[PDB]
Design a protein around this ligand. Sequence first.
Ligand SMILES: Nc1ncnc2c1ncn2[C@@H]1O[C@H](COP(=O)(O)OP(=O)(O)OP(=O)(O)O)[C@@H](O)[C@H]1O
Ligand SMILES: Nc1ncnc2c1ncn2[C@@H]1O[C@H](COP(=O)(O)OP(=O)(O)OP(=O)(O)O)[C@@H](O)[C@H]1O
Lengths: 378, 858
Amino acid sequence: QTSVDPRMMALYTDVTELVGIEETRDKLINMLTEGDDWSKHPLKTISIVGFGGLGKTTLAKAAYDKIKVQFDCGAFVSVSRNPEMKKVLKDILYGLDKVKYENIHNAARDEKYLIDDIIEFLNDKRYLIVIDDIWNEKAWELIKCAFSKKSPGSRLITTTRNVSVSEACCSSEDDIYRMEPLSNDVSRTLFCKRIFSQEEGCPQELLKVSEEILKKCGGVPLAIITIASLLANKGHIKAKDEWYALLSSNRSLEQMKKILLFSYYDLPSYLKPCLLYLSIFPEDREIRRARLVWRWISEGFVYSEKQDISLYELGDSYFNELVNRSMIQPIGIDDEGKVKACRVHDMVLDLICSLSSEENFVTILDDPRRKMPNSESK
Amino acid sequence: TITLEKKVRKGIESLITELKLMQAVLSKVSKVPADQLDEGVKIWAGNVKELSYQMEDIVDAFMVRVNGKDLHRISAALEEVVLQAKQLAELRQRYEQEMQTSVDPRMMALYTDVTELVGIEETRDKLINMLTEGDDWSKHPLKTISIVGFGGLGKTTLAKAAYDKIKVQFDCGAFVSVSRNPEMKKVLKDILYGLDKVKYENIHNAARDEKYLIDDIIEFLNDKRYLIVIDDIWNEKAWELIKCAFSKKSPGSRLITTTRNVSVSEACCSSEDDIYRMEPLSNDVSRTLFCKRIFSQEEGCPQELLKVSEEILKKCGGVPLAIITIASLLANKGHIKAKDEWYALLSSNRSLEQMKKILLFSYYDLPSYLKPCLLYLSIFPEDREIRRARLVWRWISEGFVYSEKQDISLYELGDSYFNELVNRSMIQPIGIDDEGKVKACRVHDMVLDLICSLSSEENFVTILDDPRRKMPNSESKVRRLSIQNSKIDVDTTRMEHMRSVTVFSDNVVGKVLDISRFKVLRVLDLEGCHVSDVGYVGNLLHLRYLGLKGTHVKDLPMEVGKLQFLLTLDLRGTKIEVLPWSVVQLRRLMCLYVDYGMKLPSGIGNLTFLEVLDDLGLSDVDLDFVKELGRLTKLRVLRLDFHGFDQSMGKALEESISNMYKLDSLDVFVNRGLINCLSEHWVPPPRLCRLAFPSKRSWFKTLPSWINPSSLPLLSYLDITLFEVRSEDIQLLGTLPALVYLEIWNYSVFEEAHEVEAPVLSSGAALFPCATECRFIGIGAVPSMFPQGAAPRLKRLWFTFPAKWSSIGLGMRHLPSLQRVVVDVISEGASREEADEAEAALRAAAEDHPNRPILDIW
Ligand SMILES: Nc1ncnc2c1ncn2[C@@H]1O[C@H](COP(=O)(O)OP(=O)(O)OP(=O)(O)O)[C@@H](O)[C@H]1O
Ligand SMILES: Nc1ncnc2c1ncn2[C@@H]1O[C@H](COP(=O)(O)OP(=O)(O)OP(=O)(O)O)[C@@H](O)[C@H]1O
């Protein structure tokens, strides 16, 4: 049969296991209400952006559960990558009132009548609605119709991985919240709590390997949690040399890989090679963009049939699109007014290296790891 | 050599069958919108198209040229093309692996805010008045209104506005939309659910046939007033079925329908007064919409942008969809773009994709045999207008028009194709031809861009402009070429397989390119160019259309007799005087345009199949010529000149004319004097439909006797100048059944010194059925002409009135439909004091009429 989205179980995680939410939760809550007469201003929309595994839907869920009391009706809907609009509208309706629209998932009407139902139900009410995991523009363009009328005091929240989608949702660029990774102390406490759960005392021999591992994670809660479960080995903590072996180099790991690969399976077909090409450069350094663009043009990944196009600006567009989908961190400003360099997360780099190795796209030569392929003549 | 002949025949028959199959497949493919095809099928279809072109060329070569060398070349080409076909088949089979739906883009527009519509109030109130129209509207029978126009014009918006405004004064209503390929069950369920959301709340899950749903609708509407809107009807069967639910009679109920097709609207409404034709916005309204959309708050356009703004607004054409999309494109909500960027856009995103997808519905709906005929319009320049006869003859020459019936003329098929294109609101017709049909046509500019892109993606047509649209980067096989900017230079050494060349340049460099190398041509069109002489027209052997109009050609090579296939030969405005004799030997020839100053050779009787002959000389000609004229039997248009023609032999000419059974139009031009032909006891052809004598200085005597409505049952046009008109001559014209148009001159009033005599009509009613215009130039009377109310369709009247008759009444209430009157007064007999008296009198007589026509005294 078909499997279920691995991100669904995370909605049933206990609340006493979240480390550093209070600050961000209260900041978002203040961004929503913001005043004493917030219940008299026009409808507002907030959006949250970042890369996968950063903790967006967790924060939205926290704020929603905290302040849902001060409204009349609300819902918490999730849109996937390839959505069916009927399903989304039925989900909204069933979330607004479980009794009246109890059998709404069996009705067979088109989108116009479902939108009319949503409009009629929301007349003269304050509502708080969260829409999750939007992946492109058409979906929002259609769902926006149900919130066309004006309603003083109502609020919308959306979460996404794509930046242009967030610019299209919100009106002002002050209504965008950018998720950012945890600090070092918070990450360390999460780690300890996750593994040394009760002692919360790290032995000394493990300190420096712990620090290098935490640096490799980068403050992303998903990676921290998965590696902590890997090293926990609930029966027994592993040995120091085994920690070293892991650093140099299961269900949770498969889940993390499957989750991160959503952004790769979503790219247009002409952008997949341009991404794998990043597995040529070493780990932590940064890459000049001009080098990348000229090498892409030389390899033959950039072409068009129009008569009046310059390949340089096509390549630049490809680079900006890769940055747009939150798969690359830009750094600095070039001497011609553009980005200077780019960085890549380390787990993403490992995924890319494995993907590109499974197809003879690139062969790397390190002595400890990644030696010559055993049986390959080409 | 006997064996070779037998083999080539077999190969050709095989190719013909294969061509049929390939065309079936391609037509099947070309229906799917581009978003549902996969790349494999698309690539394979392109290659199949190319092979089809090659095989057509081989078949044509065999048909024309049939010796040893020819048969050898043909056998070689046959073998090669068969091999290529097999190879492509294997290639497709090698990489075949088997391994949601979007929403209508027009749906979001129903949720647009109402404060963003600019100029609705007037049209909205006009439609509302067309619906109610009175105080007792709630007691008249059921009425149906329809709205027509092209896409993006604002039909459903207007319907929605009126509906929301007046829905209160009814009991029940609904707003349903039918798509292109509808399911009738879904439409009926939609109506039911719209009428009552509570009772029929779960109606979309019921599973009954159409009969029971129709019965439910009929039972619910019993004893109620309802207002129902039905949207986006695309053909006739849908309405034919939905009409059954509104079969009973219900006083006070109303229906509205909106559509893009004209025949559908004629089938919905009863009277042609219940049709609303949407028309684009004016210039001021369009400009305010533009500004509002972009400069939203300032509403102040900077000066440097004024003229580019005006050119852009002219290109949009007043269609709200285009205005809105281009305004969003130039807005760039972050920042208004720069002036040079505006220029770049003018010379040359989500909203743009949506607009293209919306406009392409009318293209994906055409029958398969009409899609090429539309793409062919991408050959002509942007804003000019196109003659329809040119189009029709070029379509026939290219091979787009064919049928298997035995008794059909391709000219009327082509005319039907043109009228169908006009019917679907994809072409704007302009003017009236000299044979009673449309003259020219225009195309919207965005539609033109869409057509150009579509036709370019398939090597259908290659255009040559220097700034944009240069030679294709990697293309060795070009079939149809269109030269518009003579600045470019052409290679024309790889273009072996041309089919059609057209030059639009007044420029000298236009005549520079060599033509004798295109050994396979079908259409040569040099109309307007300044070429001087063409001796290479022979040795082409494949032509079908030779268009030389308005060129400086002095004389033709006496080798045109070799072109055994030549449908059209157009010589007008050239400097030719005598046609070469070998012209007689063009057995397949269907159209001959020529000036009356050119000498035709003798044996013209051999040119059977002639369907159109223009401006015969008829001067310095013997009798056997006028007798030969009687052999062209299937001839539908004729024009004569009678210039030097001796009027002693008119009887033979009239017999030869009476011999042509199929015939529609006829002209006779005579300089002066009395016309000494077409005597009485003539028996005109039965199907005649248009007759004209544009002389205006050569009169008939009293009237031809053969004008009785039995001999000419069909007639919709007439133009005669009589010597002296009687009173019981207009009577005979009243007897004529159709007679849409009419124009009579009285020769004695002007050239002689006779005076205007008042004609009186008597003994009858309904004298002029279907007479929309009448110009009695030389004779006039308003009341006594039309007693009891006759000609209840007239719209323009021309008559003369002496000032003597100031002391007959000018009451214009006999005639309801009057809209325009043109008068001229003769003031020498009566004094000025009677003159201004009569002027004010007829002015008041025009003012009392409810329609309030316009006057002109002259
Ligand atoms: N502050 C935190 N403390 C502990 N765990 C956290 C915290 N924030 C997030 N997590 C954990 O991170 C995991 C993934 O987070 P989440 O799925 O909310 O990120 P996301 O932005 O929704 O990812 P995606 O963009 O793929 O939907 C969850 O299992 C959650 O338990
Ligand atoms: N008077 C107006 N002012 C502003 N916008 C208008 C006006 N009329 C129409 N529009 C806009 O034009 C767009 C298309 O109009 P509409 O779809 O009603 O035309 P239509 O005749 O229904 O087209 P189709 O024949 O394809 O259904 C709509 O988005 C509407 O907002």
